[PDB]
């Protein structure tokens, strides 16, 4: 029974990783398509002013954002991948952000900034949903060490998402992949520790892989 559970738990985590293999890549394609718009909105919406105020650049960034309801279609694909784990917060924040795009006021830079702030908060929520989805699957295992290394990993991984959502997401996805596919984790920093939160996250990813390895081995 303990092994019939741990077997299903190992299978659940593997089904998660394969289903969500592309989550980091897909979020980056969204970031990359919409960064110029987000930049234009932020540039001419500061209350410190002193930048004229091309309201047509802000109006164009909002149009790029709204076009063919695309960005909403792109976030809903990510919400579909995590679904078995209930991204209920996420579905609402996307539905809400879609309404934010529908209700946007041309020639109002403060509204534009508010749509742009909503995009940024949604994007980090999409990241958190992946972490929350993992914590759910990791909650069902019983091994004391794996559960402690899971809590520490999730805590350290949220701190990393709080610093940089997209950078956090890629090292998180690569860590799950490393564990799902019997590979050890690379603890060498990829950004000369520019992101102060990477090292403690990686330290936590190594300890979890040893505890996950130890569980796998009871079944071989």
């Amino acid at each position: 029974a303990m092994g019939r559970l741990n077997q299903r738990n190992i299978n659940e985590l593997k089904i998660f990783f394969e289903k969500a293999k592309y989550y980091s890549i897909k979020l980056d394609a969204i970031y990359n398509e919409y960064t110029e718009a987000y930049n234009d909105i932020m540039t001419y919406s500061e209350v410190n002013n002193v930048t004229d105020s091309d309201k047509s650049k802000v109006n164009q960034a909002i149009s790029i954002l709204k076009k063919d309801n695309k960005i909403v279609n792109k976030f809903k694909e990510l919400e579909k991948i995590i679904e078995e784990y209930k991204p209920i917060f996420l579905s609402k924040l996307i539905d809400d952000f879609a309404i934010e795009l529908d209700q946007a006021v041309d020639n109002d830079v403060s509204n534009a900034r508010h749509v742009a702030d909503s995009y940024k908060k949604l994007r980090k929520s999409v990241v958190l949903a992946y972490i929350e989805s993992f914590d759910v699957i990791s909650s069902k295992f019983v091994d004391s060490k794996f559960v402690e290394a899971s809590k520490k990993f999730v805590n350290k991984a949220k701190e990393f998402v709080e610093e940089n959502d997209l950078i956090a997401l890629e090292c998180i996805v690569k860590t799950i992949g490393d564990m799902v596919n019997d590979r050890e984790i690379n603890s060498r920093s990829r950004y000369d520790n520019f992101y102060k939160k990477e090292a403690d996250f990686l330290g936590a990813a190594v300890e979890l892989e040893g505890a996950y390895k130890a569980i796998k081995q009871t079944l071989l």
């Binding site: 980056d28 970031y31 990359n32 960064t35 110029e36 987000y38 930049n39 234009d40 932020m42 540039t43 001419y44 500061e46 410190n48 002193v50 930048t51 004229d52 091309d54 940089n164 997209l166 950078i167 890629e170 990829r190 950004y191 000369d192 520019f194 992101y195």
Partner: protein
């Protein structure tokens, strides 16, 4: 009277129909002129005076491009929202894990704004 009515890119003289009957005009004579939005006189305003010179109209380039450097989301942002004039280069830098497209580092304020457009991509 060497100077005919001036052709001014991105602007023109105030009061075209009032002033044209008086042309062509003597060396030393000057006229209020404007630049269209996105453009700037060499005095950094929306208007200046253009002078009839032995060498033609002065300033020779009466309207210049006004480029505001954008906020860059995962970028080093010292230059965010600062005003630059047509001809100005700036060396642009992204946070590690982000970079400018095509690995470019320099953007120049040109006739149609920044070239290339600086953005930090993943």
């Amino acid at each position: 009277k060497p100077c005919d009515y001036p052709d001014i890119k991105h602007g023109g003289l105030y009061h075209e129909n009032m002033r044209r009957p008086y042309f062509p005009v003597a060396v030393g004579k000057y006229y209020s002129y404007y630049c269209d939005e996105h453009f700037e006189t060499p005095s950094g305003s929306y208007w200046d005076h253009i002078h009839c010179t032995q060498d033609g109209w002065s300033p020779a380039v009466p309207c210049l491009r006004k480029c505001y450097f954008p906020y860059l989301e995962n970028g080093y942002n010292q230059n965010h929202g600062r005003k630059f004039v047509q001809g100005k280069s700036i060396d642009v830098a992204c946070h590690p894990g982000y970079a400018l497209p095509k690995a470019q580092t320099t953007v120049t304020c040109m006739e149609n704004g920044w070239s290339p457009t600086p953005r930090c991509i993943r």
